[PDB]
Design a binder for this molecule. Structure first.
Ligand SMILES: [Mg+2]
Ligand SMILES: [Mg+2]
Ligand SMILES: [Mg+2]
Length: 135
RNA sequence: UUGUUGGUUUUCGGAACUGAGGCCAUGAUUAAGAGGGACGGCCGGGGGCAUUCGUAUUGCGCCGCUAGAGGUGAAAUUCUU
């Protein structure tokens, strides 16, 4: 079902991983990124909203992305990790490691890894007020 | 400053204006680790006007795949074939 490639050569995809503190997205596209092979999220694997960002949920999602990518015919992935970005946090959420760990452990070749968190050159006011989120 | 009068022969001192002189060693303290100002080469997210760029947030159009997404201590209001 995949492309006709020599067995000494492999076909590359791009896995956009969006690891927030509320959910994890494992999204594999082609090199252009316009076409999609398989987007599974951490909320598609758990029943509780609290666990949508869990490392376990991120691992299970990465595993479904790995199987679909292989059956479609992807063999290697370029990783593009991102946090929420913008005015929000820049550290990737707890599911970032498990998703990338699960991809490598699922027999998925890894190409180039790069952080793509959108960083503002300063921007819109952040939510919370000047006194912040007084939790 | 002439005692027979008066005219005094008058002189007299002072007070103004004015010209030419000489003479004074002729006449201006210093340059504030006070200040002002000049100049010189710099220096600075100092101020005003115009201009340029940056990515992000939000919205929209097209395309892809898909059933969730979001949010939280947990949720729900909310968005969604
Ligand atoms: Mg969540
Ligand atoms: Mg959620
Ligand atoms: Mg406190």
């Amino acid at each position: 079902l995949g492309p006709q490639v020599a067995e000494g050569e492999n076909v590359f995809g791009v896995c956009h991983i969006f690891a927030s503190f509320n959910d994890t997205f494992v999204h594999v596209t082609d090199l252009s990124g316009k076409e999609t092979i398989c987007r599974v999220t951490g909320g598609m694997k758990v029943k509780a909203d609290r666990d949508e960002s869990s490392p376990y949920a991120a691992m299970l999602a990465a595993q479904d992305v790995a199987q679909r990518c292989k059956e479609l015919g992807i063999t290697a992935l370029h990783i593009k990790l991102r946090a929420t970005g913008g005015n929000r946090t820049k550290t990737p959420g707890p599911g970032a490691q498990s998703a990338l760990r699960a991809l490598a452990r699922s027999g998925m070749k890894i190409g180039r890894i790069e952080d793509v968190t959108p960083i503002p050159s300063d921007s819109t006011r952040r939510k919370g007020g000047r006194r912040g989120r007084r939790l």
